[PDB]
Amino acid sequence: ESYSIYVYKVLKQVHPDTGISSKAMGIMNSFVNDIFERIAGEASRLAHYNKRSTITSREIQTAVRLLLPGELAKHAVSEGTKAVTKYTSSKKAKTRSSRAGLQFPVGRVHRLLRKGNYSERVGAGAPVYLAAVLEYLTAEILELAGNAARDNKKTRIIPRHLQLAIRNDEELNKLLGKVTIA
Amino acid sequence: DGEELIGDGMERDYRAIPELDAYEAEGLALDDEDVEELTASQREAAERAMRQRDREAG
Amino acid sequence: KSTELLIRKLPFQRLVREIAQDFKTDLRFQSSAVMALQEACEAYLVGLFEDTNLCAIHAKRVTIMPKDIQLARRIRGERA
Amino acid sequence: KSTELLIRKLPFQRLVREIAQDFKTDLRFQSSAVMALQEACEAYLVGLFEDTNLCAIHAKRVTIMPKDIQLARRIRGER
Amino acid sequence: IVKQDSLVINLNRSNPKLKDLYIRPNIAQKRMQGSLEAHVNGFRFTSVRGDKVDILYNNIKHALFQPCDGEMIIVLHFHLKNAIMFGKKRHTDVQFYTEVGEITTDLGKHQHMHDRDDLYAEQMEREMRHKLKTAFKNFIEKVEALTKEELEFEVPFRDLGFNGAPYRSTCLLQPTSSALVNATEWPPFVVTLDEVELIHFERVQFHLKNFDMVIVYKDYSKKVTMINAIPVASLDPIKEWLNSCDLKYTEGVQSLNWTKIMKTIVDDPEGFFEQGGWSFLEPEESEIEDETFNPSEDDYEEEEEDSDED
Amino acid sequence: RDNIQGITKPAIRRLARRGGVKRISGLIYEETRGVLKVFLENVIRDAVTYTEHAKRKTVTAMDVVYALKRQ
Amino acid sequence: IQGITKPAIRRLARRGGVKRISGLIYEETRGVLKVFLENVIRDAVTYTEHAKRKTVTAMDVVYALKRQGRTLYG
């Protein structure tokens, strides 16, 4: 799956005047798919452990707590709960993405969650929570990768800027676990 | 005893040999959108089969 | 780049196809698939060499031996 | 079954409840939970000691030292 | 190889002394044990077998104190300005250490008792450790008083320590005010910070859990010093400590032939600085190859909408 | 609260004896204790996360076993 | 044979921090790689078989690597 245009939206939000190279964009996409598979896999195992047949926002939240390190877990949980309450309080927004105040596609997330056969049923709040977590992690990475690009006096984020952002952050390095990329 | 790795002639290993620096296209094949993305159910069944294969050996 | 060229690409792809002849008799590989394969092989070998040099240092030897390689793999959980 | 519980149950259970206090979350522990923790901790330590003894042999030493423990954990990929 | 002034021994009450010390290096192939005595202008070490080794205050380049906290021994180390000889060959480093105890307890039927008295013996070890550290501290203060600030002992900063392998053995190196030091393992590692021209870090790249650290001296005939296989987690801390001692550092993916580099420099010292000096260590094709992202293949419609509702 | 001191030196000695260790340096005990406190912490951190997902204040044995699968 | 060149083996060990090499290493390294590459291909072709494709793609390689170590490509 391709999340590139949504990563570009997130990049324009944290660093309005910073671009990204084709290899670096492909790196961001593979990170998003990797974590999506990990969080989705953890939410399905939790759904079978409690003998439920449905994955709700609660299953996504506990999965994010288990996989992310401390501060990243706290920040991702906060963003997820905020997007769910925005989606749960107001019906006015035309698109489900703008309903929760997110750039990442909630509909694509919900479609992929159901495609993977992780559970019998997928609740309404789970894809909003997963999209918000994916958006925050992309923002934190792009913020740090943008900070590295500014320090190198480069106008765009190239692969090595991504590597610096990741391994120099303890939690980001732990979360990726030094996945290999070239 | 052994064989040093840091000394004069170290650079000899790092020569660009163009006949060997690139992939050849003998068995390499290019789909031009002919191949398809792997389907989720097939991936699940493949992982199940690989688990069964691993169990029978170790 | 001269530094980045760790494994020559052509002998690696001959070895990939020689292994490919043992699982499915007629196979074709994508250029991106083999390039990912070479990248992964180089990173795994470097990670094993680092552990090996750690084992050699533990043995008070500047030179690494198959003793060190086998110990690193055993602790890593590869071959009993 | 075959496993013998070397670590005394009471001080280990003290340690488990201390770990609960550090996290600052108040939860109860079943007795079965604490024993499963004790079995896993002892098994992990024995397995780590096996790799540690392997490191000591490689150094031509009969005695194990913290050097050996650190090397084995480093290769295992721990922190 | 270098003449040394005769030790000035005064017979009086002021004679600070310290017992139960093993000398490194030894004089025979057997561990010689004796006592260290602080005289007017130097130290006298009296062995049980009568062996006596002397070290002048003016001959001490670095007096180092390693406390027994976190170690099996407590050490006084001395790196000398000029080499001295007391056994066969000449020794440039001389140290005196006292073991904490329990060095090698062995498992078997001898420790099968597994009594609960080890708590009291732990206190006896704690008292022994506090005794050893207090006696070493008192002897250092007496000697630092005697020299009239001619020689200052230095205590390593374990907060700044890191694990590295200079001598093909992964040990702990701790900075001091004047040097980078590891005196717990023989042979010892002493490098004077003042004598360091710069630092170059090799094998620094993603997906690597270790790196080599290269020490280049202001004296260019001296071969560089390697510290191999430091965890990557120790890189940024070491860098900061270097910034506190005003030592310039560089990075490099590829390991460099330093013996060849030094030779090229020494045989033409002038032309080396005309290319820029050490400008080759710090940077200033890959931009042309990579392509910046642009909107392509339109985008997903995202207008599917619908929800479970009730 | 220092209960990582409460894991006895004999208990460390017994664990090494089952592990094949013949001879042990003095500094091992503290290193063993710190390693254990790290490992137990990771499991307990995970285990409590399962317990409150089921909305319970009591950690069960099944919570411990699922956390061990992660490590 | 394997044909993984001795200079390629040397370059790998150099980046790993190795300073001195025993002559036995070259064939030992070749044998170790022969294990590792075989295992990944065994998993990857299985992913290829389940899809009605006779050509292994990069995504098949990445899926096999997820079982051991994740790569962020493709």
Side-chain angles (χ1 to χ4, degrees), chain C residues 3-49:
Chain C
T3 308
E4 314 300 323
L5 191 65
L6 295 184
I7 296 185
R8 220 48 62 92
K9 299 187 177 183
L10 212 166
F12 176 80
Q13 79 183 135
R14 284 199 194 110
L15 181 63
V16 170
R17 288 170 191 176
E18 184 194 327
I19 302 182
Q21 300 172 339
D22 308 335
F23 299 119
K24 178 54 198 59
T25 60
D26 278 341
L27 266 181
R28 306 179 183 181
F29 276 79
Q30 182 187 6
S31 179
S32 306
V34 181
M35 179 156 88
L37 283 171
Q38 186 171 340
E39 295 289 346
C41 288
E42 296 188 4
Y44 159 83
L45 286 185
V46 172
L48 177 57
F49 270 118

Side-chain angles (χ1 to χ4, degrees), chain D residues 8 63 65 67 70 74-75 77, chain E residues 116 169-170 185 210 229 231:
Chain D
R8 297 184 182 181
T63 83
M65 314 206 65
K67 190 161 302 190
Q70 287 156 14
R74 203 173 175 179
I75 298 176
Chain E
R116 307 173 188 178
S169 180
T170 305
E185 300 184 4
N210 293 277

